[PDB]
Known about the structure:
The structure is a homodimer. By secondary structure, chain A is α+β, with helices and mostly antiparallel strands. Chain A has a single domain (1-162), classed as Gcn5-related N-acetyltransferase (GNAT) (Aminopeptidase, 3-Layer(aba) Sandwich). In chain A, 30% of the residues lie in helices and 29% in strands. The first copy, chain A, has six helices and six strands. Chain A has helices at residues 13-18, 37-41, 52-63, 94-97, 117-132, 146-151, and strands spanning 24-27, 69-75, 81-91, 99-108, 136-141, 155-164. In chain A, strands 1-2-3-4-5 form a five-stranded mixed sheet. In chain A, strand 2 and strand 3 form a beta hairpin. Chains A and B meet through helix 2, helix 3, strand 3, helix 4 and strand 4 of A and helix 2, helix 3, strand 3, helix 4 and strand 4 of B. Strand 5 (136-141) of chain A pairs antiparallel with strand 6 (155-164) of chain B, so a sheet runs across the interface. The complex binds 2-acetamido-2-deoxy-6-O-phosphono-alpha-D-glucopyranose (2 copies). One 2-acetamido-2-deoxy-6-O-phosphono-alpha-D-glucopyranose sits between chains B (45-46, 103-106, 139-141) and A (94-95, 100). One 2-acetamido-2-deoxy-6-O-phosphono-alpha-D-glucopyranose (16G) sits between chains B (45-46, 103-106, 139-141) and A (94-95, 100). Chains A, B: It is an enzyme of class 2 (transferase).
Amino acid sequence: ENTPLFSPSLISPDVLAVLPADYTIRPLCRSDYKRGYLDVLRVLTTVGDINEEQWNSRYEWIRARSDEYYLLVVCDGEGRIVGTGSLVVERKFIHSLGMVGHIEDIAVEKGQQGKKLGLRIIQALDYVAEKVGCYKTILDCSEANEGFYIKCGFKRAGLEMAHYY
Amino acid sequence: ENTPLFSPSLISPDVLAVLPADYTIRPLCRSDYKRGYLDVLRVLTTVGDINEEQWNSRYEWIRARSDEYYLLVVCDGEGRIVGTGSLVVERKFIHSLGMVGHIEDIAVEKGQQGKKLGLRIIQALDYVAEKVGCYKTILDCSEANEGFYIKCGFKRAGLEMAHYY
Ligand SMILES: CC(=O)N[C@@H]1[C@@H](O)[C@H](O)[C@@H](COP(=O)(O)O)O[C@@H]1O
Ligand SMILES: CC(=O)N[C@@H]1[C@@H](O)[C@H](O)[C@@H](COP(=O)(O)O)O[C@@H]1O
């Protein structure tokens, strides 16, 4: 239930050193359903009603793929989840069988925003991607939050195109 | 060796119906190393020297994940690979445990460009993503080829940001 989704060794030591006092950044675990996890994702977009059995099923799917999916959380001093971020590592044939990190689903609870937690999440995900051998990490953002990603050390690389069903 | 990476049933019947005569669109198979596959990817970006043992290893990795990675090719009337495209299906918690299709590594050999093959590749990948239950498909492009993606029925959705290592 409390077993980390991936090795705690993958959490950037430099990030841990600079986090506000008593806050923590760590891999997701299964019991995080019960600690406010989904409620954090709701600041970002539509989540829907998900029951515990559904959470468990999808968590186990991700856990079986913990060499691809790296989901982590920021917890406050009371152990509540207040921030989320994901990295998905894509395998390619190009770049000599390279790998590309994709940052996804970045969210910080409204009352906890503007305190560098989002920056620390991005820094942690970048550390994972580099460490496992990705040649780059990419993500998509809006015009309204491009400046956040700039402050995280990302640079504009192209355009996101979409087809919704 | 010739076993398709994923079910031929996932190849859009409407796309097959409109492809130029004798051309085919079909899943990757292992023996495609020997049919010009990597040489097509070279129009898109850096590929590097990859030997057959390396190809086989990475192919098997992808094949073990054929519910995530959908790589397909266009072959000309002589069975040479002249086009490539990939779809990677990401699992989420948001959108009621939704899935997002990601189009990647789109390439058509120089002498075969401007004949709707790229359009057919995109159409085929969109069909896979919808059929397996994705709520949308996204991709990143440059300003210079945005117009191609527009002609494929994609619309601008945001900005691609990157951090290279
Ligand atoms: C860096 C980051 O947080 N990117 C996310 C992406 O991960 C998520 O899939 C999407 C959901 O938006 P949607 O509900 O309209 O698909 O929003 C943003 O693009
Ligand atoms: C739609 C499409 O074809 N997208 C590709 C992407 O799949 C690939 O990973 C990248 C490689 O570029 P890079 O060599 O600079 O990483 O180019 C384009 O963004």
